[PDB]
Amino acid sequence: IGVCYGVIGNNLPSRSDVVQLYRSKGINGMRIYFADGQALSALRNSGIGLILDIGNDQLANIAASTSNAASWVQNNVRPYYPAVNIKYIAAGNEVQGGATQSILPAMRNLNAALSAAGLGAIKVSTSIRFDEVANSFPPSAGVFKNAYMTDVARLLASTGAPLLANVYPYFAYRDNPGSISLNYATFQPGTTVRDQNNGLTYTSLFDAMVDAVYAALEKAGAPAVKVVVSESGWPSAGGFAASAGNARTYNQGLINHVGGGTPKKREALETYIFAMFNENQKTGDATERSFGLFNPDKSPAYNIQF
């Protein structure tokens, strides 16, 4: 499985220390949020598959021209591939506003540049959050609420690239403690929901969520498009339901689950746990600083067998 690697803290390890920890624990996937040169160099011949986000601040620059995208590929990708196994490139992460207007042309522009560079194995996609999907209940009722997402699904369909989704049962649960049980949320026996539309049964909030993305994809006209869960995790402190036991239970649960897929698609699901270390400098809710599997000093936040 993979682990997202965030560096928004003032007390984290060196990139090479990081890569080493990964190889020790047997983690075979990494997501990085910008073209981090030190991470990339450290990653050479490490055998770790990678999701490379371009960085939202780069979206407009890349969307402008193919020469802009070629220059980015030349500096940030060409020097590391194929030694570094970059599997995907996320042209934007949870972009909002008029910026969404830039995601399709940046996606095209990168596809053209990778092509001419002779790097067509690398696939181009975009990272979204679940709040992109409406009428998620029953999961079969899922539909993309924004118009631009259909444009994207179609491009992914024709290019053979998957969709990267940030799925967090924690946020769903946190918002709706009354309607949602901790068991259902953390992969524990107890609850069963039946999708009337297709008759599938659901025992976990995770499955129900992923299958809602699949519902939406199909409606968009992109049935064969796969989903890569580009983020999923549970905080160990800073708010409601945040605790090591809950965080241990969710993540281990997650690791032991994804290999069986979901009721709509029983194939193993590619998933990235958020995140490797707690980022002591994040803003927003107190929980943001407590999503790590490890403590800044490389010590296990709680025990997880990968």
Curated annotation (Swiss-Prot):
Name of one Pfam family that matches: Glyco_hydro_17
EC primary class: hydrolase
pH dependence remark: Optimum pH is 4.5 (at 37 degrees Celsius).
EC number(s) from the headed UniProt entry: 3.2.1.39
Residue stretches spanning the membrane: none
GO molecular function: glucan endo-1,3-beta-D-glucosidase activity
UniProtKB keywords: Glycosidase, Hydrolase, Plant defense, Signal
Xref: SUPFAM superfamilies: (Trans)glycosidases (SSF51445)
Active site: 94, 231
Catalytic activity: Hydrolysis of (1->3)-beta-D-glucosidic linkages in (1->3)-beta-D-glucans
One BP term from GO: (1->3)-beta-D-glucan catabolic process
Function of the protein: May provide a degree of protection against microbial invasion of germinated barley grain through its ability to degrade fungal cell wall polysaccharides. Hydrolyzes laminarin in vitro.
Family, similarity comment: Belongs to the glycosyl hydrolase 17 family.
The protein's name: Glucan endo-1,3-beta-glucosidase GII
The organism of origin for this protein: Hordeum vulgare
